[PDB]
Amino acid sequence: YRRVKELMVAPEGMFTGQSMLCGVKAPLAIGNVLPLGQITEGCIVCNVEAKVGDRGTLARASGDYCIIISHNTETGRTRLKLPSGQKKTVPSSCRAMIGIVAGGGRIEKPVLKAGNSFYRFRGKRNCWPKVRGVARNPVEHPHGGGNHQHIGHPSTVSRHAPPGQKVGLIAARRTGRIRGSRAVR
RNA sequence: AGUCAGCGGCGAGCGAAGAGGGAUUCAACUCGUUGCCGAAUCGGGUCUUAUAUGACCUCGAACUGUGGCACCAUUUUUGU
RNA sequence: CCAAGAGAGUAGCACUGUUUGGGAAUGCAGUGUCAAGCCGGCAGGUAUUUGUCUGCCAAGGUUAAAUAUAGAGUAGGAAG
RNA sequence: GUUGUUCGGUCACUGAGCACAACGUUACACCGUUUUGUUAGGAAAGUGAAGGUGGUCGGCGCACAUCUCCCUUUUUUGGGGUUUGUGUGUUUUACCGGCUUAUCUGAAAAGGGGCAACAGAGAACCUGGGAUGAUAUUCCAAAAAGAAAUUGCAUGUGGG
RNA sequence: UCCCAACUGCAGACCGUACUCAUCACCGCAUCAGGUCCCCAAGCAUCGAAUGCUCUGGUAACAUAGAGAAAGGUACACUCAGGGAAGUCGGCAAAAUAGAUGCGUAAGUUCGCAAGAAGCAUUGGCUCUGAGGGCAAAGUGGGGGUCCACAGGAGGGCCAGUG
RNA sequence: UUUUCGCUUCCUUUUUUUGGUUGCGCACCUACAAAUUGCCAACUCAGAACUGCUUACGGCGGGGAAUCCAACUGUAUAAUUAAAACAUAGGUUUGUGAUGCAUCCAAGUGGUGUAUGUCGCAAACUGAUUUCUGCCCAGUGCUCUGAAUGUCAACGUGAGAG
RNA sequence: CUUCGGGCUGUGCGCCGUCUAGGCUGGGCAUAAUUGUGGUGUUUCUUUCACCGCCACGGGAGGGGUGUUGGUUUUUUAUCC
RNA sequence: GAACUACUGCGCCAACGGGGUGGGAACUUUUCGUUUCUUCUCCGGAGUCUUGUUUCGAGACAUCUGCCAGAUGGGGAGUUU
RNA sequence: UCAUUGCCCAAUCUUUGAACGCAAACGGCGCAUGGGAGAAGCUCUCUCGAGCCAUCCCCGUGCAUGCCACAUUUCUCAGUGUCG
RNA sequence: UGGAAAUGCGAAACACUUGCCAGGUGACCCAUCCAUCCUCCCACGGUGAGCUUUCUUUUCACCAUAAUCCACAUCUCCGGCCUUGCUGGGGCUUGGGCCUCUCGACUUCUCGCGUUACUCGGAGCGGGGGCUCAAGAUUGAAAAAUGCAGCUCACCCUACGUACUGUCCUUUGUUGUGAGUUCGGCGCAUUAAAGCAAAAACCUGGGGUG
RNA sequence: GCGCACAUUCGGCUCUUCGUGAUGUUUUUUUACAUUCAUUGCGACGCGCGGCUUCCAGGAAUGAAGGAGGGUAGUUCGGGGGAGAACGUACUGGUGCGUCAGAGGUGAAAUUCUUAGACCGCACCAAGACGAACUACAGCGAAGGCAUUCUUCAAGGAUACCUUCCUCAAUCAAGAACCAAAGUGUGGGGAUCAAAGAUGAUUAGAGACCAUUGUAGUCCACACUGCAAACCAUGACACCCAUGAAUUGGGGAACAUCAUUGGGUGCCCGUGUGGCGGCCUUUUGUGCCGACCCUCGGCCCCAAUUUAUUUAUCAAUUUAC
């Protein structure tokens, strides 16, 4: 033999190791890697870069894909739409692998029990169960004390806030029940 | 002189020098800006000489080491 | 027949701080700023301009001896 | 009074984890940091000359053996040659094969340093012993202890 | 080419090694009921590392002891008549609960339970019985034992035998 | 038994092909009972008798009916307190898309979230399911991309012997 | 700068002027032919399709396979399907 | 110069040519010359070239270059109450 | 020629150690070089024997790091710095 | 270097290199039962010891290590000469070959399923490898080991002799391994490396340069 | 009506042997010359016969098809459905400017917006929506419900037939499968309309009408639901009945032939080795031209399509293409 490998980051289900021949001299199989600009608007790509030379920062989580919503062929900029209500305009330049996360979030699933949560979080540093601010010793914490279960002051802070003075609900322009909608009306 | 120096909630509290007497001392010293220049006057090495010196390379060194001179002088200056 | 060959982002100044008994600043450090016709430069303890007058000539460069030893110093005495 | 070519440990491995170069500190004799990094961070296959061994071949010299062919004599005895077979020469050379001097070519990163496992990973012994006072899968040697296993390295012969 | 095998000859470092490893060798200040990881684990009953006695082993344990049968205690000691929580802050305490089996089981419920819900019933010994599996050759007849088949055996080994 | 079971003999067609024929074999228990029987075997449960008298070893869950409270299992104050506490799934909002956010740090090309990217992370609040979650934004915060000319430091800027 | 002259120059512009980038489409042309789309073979339609063209290159086994044994062998040689 | 992949579907890689020089071979009468081989050497691989940068990105602003200046600041400080 | 006398010049000085070949709860383990010793082999056939020499082991000493000078009168390189 | 094949061998020699080897070569959870090995108990026999008084079949004991082959006979062919050949276990894996399952079926299961024309199944073959065995051989019995006992100089020595014996077999009930991440778990998916085999490679040996 | 003289009657088409081996004859001819023809062979079909030989078989064996049922087959019809895509265009929100002293809303105004700058105009975007008048006692759909396009997908109906099929049915408890709005859970979803609410205003009161907005909803993905003056307040199925007057919606079938037949100096670069003339060239030939003429064709024109049924002929049975 003697080739070049072909496995890395996971999007949808080809079965592995596959001969994708790339750049724009990629054809356009799903997962295939073509420049996003040279991928046609409205197409669904996955893991687009952003930095360029990053192999997929964006949408680097499970489920998505992202949609190109624009080319600016004059500059060679492109406006792509982050899954989030959020557009990012990157150069049209950028690599991308055709498609979607084969994955599609477990988020839907109802989680069920503690144990599950235990196995769940584990790959990283430990971070859960989670107790709350209101008893967490005053000496280290803002929300301890009070001769019973409550909030002191508004949880709505200026962003700038000291650490130790800054936790919770940063500068919430609004909070609580979303009685309306955010962004455009 | 804990002072007429004086700092200082000017408070607390702080706070010195000069001189004199005196000890000790015959204590004093270079370079960089001056013509320094008949194959760097040098240095390292080498080799002589019993060391310098001699000598020769090396090649550190003319991007400057030597020597001379160093705002007290040189006589300022003029006796060129 | 004349020369006349003396230290710079340093000095200084602002600014900040720190620091000083040192006072409208004793220093230092940072930062910025940033000097010499050389009728010069520095100093002359109330800010200044302004002028004299008075003392030096910094910002590179070396230097016994008289002193210390203060707590844990080491060789060799003398003691109370 | 605790005996090991074999058991362990741990000759090396990786885990989490911890150099040095660098880069940070008023600050190496209090370091901080980094944890393989502003680093030029190490040697081949192959060739090739060379030398040296071994083979082959090829050539060459010697000898033995040889279907067959040519020669004297009445005929056998006798000779040569052939071709073939065999053996030999430190033959010669060509050619291999080897091997070393020797000469040229000739490697890139979570890895440019090295540790980190008395349980992972984890490389050779079994049973028996009229066997010790107290040790032994270690002590028991050749024969009745024996029988093993492995390494290293020789040696000849064998395969060659 | 000779090492692309064989066999054989010849030699094996280093470092550990006893014993203890715990109701005395560890660690509880301490010859401590506290603690302290690992291997092994019979017979019988039986649900069965249970409970229990036990084998094998080990203990023969030791843990000052004797002497004693009073008060008080303490004891993982009991028992109590009738009575049945009056007691008591309080059913704490203690006591009532059982195996299994069969039978049987209310509300409610998120449908899943609730449930040993509740509640019944049964449980010896003896002496027969039943049900409940595996393991061969379908399967057969006739003829021969007035022998029918051989390699196998015994006894005949005082006959002047033979090997 | 008008097909690809096979071959032999023979006949027929040209045939020593096929086809027919024959012998044998190939597929087809259509050989087929019962499986009789032989053997050995097991302690389970069950059954029944016989029998008589025992809360007896051992080991053996009290129950019911409601109120408050917490969903639950989980968690824990060494050494008073184990719960109505926390954790907890479940509920809800912010903040936030990398020259970032969050966040650690003496400092550095330092750190971590993140060997990662909104099905993401971060941040807090609420505390199973179920069901609902009113009114107030004046206050006090927060927020604002809001406004724009009040204010707000240095900072400059021009003005007297100095 | 430079005695007129030599010397040098600048500036402005203009200048030739090294040097890369070397598929594809059109053009011209060798290409003879042929026209590597020409001519044949072939579908129902020219075409297609198959070929050929024009032009090259390399092959065509044939006998071999039974110690005879008949036949066939010329045969103790050989065939004998 | 990568194809159905048009819907999924694995096997390309180290050891490579031509030129030009030097020697020889082979062949040529044949030196000349053909041919080959050897030795050597050079060069080539839809470029080559290269004053000008690794590439991107960014950009004379963000970078807070760093330093002041101010606001803000129980996060902490310290003290007092 | 006493003296574990005295003095002292003369020397030794493990194992360590800043501690440095590497390393490290290991007398671990290396790396260059020298040196030693020796079953086997070999050889000498010396008969024995002896020697010689190998596999094998040991010891000595280098070998850490930085910085500093230097090299035959040059040590070897590198570089789009740079010469025509 | 063998056999259509599954798959073969004293040596078919062939080492660097491989943007080389989804290469169990290290490598991996638990998990499941089940299957069986192992071991283990029971018990039968049978021995040997020891027990055992009104009664008995009582008690105990009765063994075999690593390390290595797998050649005995069937059959060849029962041994003339035995010559094809060396054919020949179980019982899990897979494969391979023939036939080609279809009117659907088979099909294997304790388990959740599966399969088949994507070739079942069935046969026959090849091999994988727990295991077990196989003439079981070696090992190995031999002072084996164990238990006895008879004698013995002497037996109260001794040396602990010396000599002798016996020293066994079916058979019931526990557990390695069955290889995965092998039954479930699973918003969970079960270290790594050194460490090894293999391949590709194929340069050598089967060659006269010039 | 039947047979009949000849195929030399209109006429069939190989039943004027066929096919092929081929030869021959042909030789400015329909080349060559298969069958015919001449030579002859094999096959030979037609048709006949002949030999049969062998084997083998229904007619209607299996009523009769509902103005019963069921299909089937044929164009096609419809806002039927379902998946697509494309858009028109607006509402907005937004942008981007332009400007500008007013906007805006209203019973009355009032709450709104205002010179950052409101509106406004135009450009343009973004967004989500909606298919506007068309388009109507008009279509389709079980019902609910259903309107750009294309792209589809699979569906339905009707109509058509001499298609097959033999009651196939009917209607129907239980029982299933549907059911607008809205709600309801899980997710979109954001624009608007607007329940909740909030504001005005109003009122006597008024949180009501009315205004001004504005939260849930709304659309949708996705579920689920069953309640809707869910009205042809009218169960289904059946067989009938006025006039239909007009007019309708889909389809079929009529429109004296769209295809056919007949007729022509009307025409024709028509055909055709015919003849002729004209013209080329070694080759009267061939090749080229002739509104040359001829056989035939074409176009064009013209004519006709009768044929056709009850009932005698006969009447008459069709409006026009």
Buried b (16+ CB within 10 A) or exposed e, A22-53: eeeebeebbbbbbbbbbbeeebebbbbbbeee
Going along A92-146, which residue ranges are E strands? Answer: 95-98
- Is residue A115 within a helix (H) or strand (E), and if so which, with residue range? helix A114-121
**Nucleotide nearest residue A76, measured CA to C1':** H57
Measure CA A50 to chain center. 13
* Beta carbons of A16 and A26 less than 8 angstroms apart: no
What experiment produced this structure? cryo-EM
**A32 CA – E16 C1', rounded, Å:** 62
Is the backbone peptide bond immediately before A129 cis, with ω within 30 degrees of 0? yes
A56 CB contacts (<8 Å, ≥6 apart)?
A: A9, A46, A47, A48, A49, A96, A97
**A61 CA – D61 C1', rounded, Å:** 89
Left (φ > 0), alpha (ψ -120 to 50) or beta: where does A154 sit? beta
**Residues in a beta bridge with A72:** A77
A181 Cβ contacts chain K strand, under 7 Å: yes
Closest CA to A161 of A152, A172, A170: A170
| Token code pair at residue A145 | 């004390």
Place of tokens 């072909």: A6
A18 Cβ contacts chain J strand, under 7 Å: no
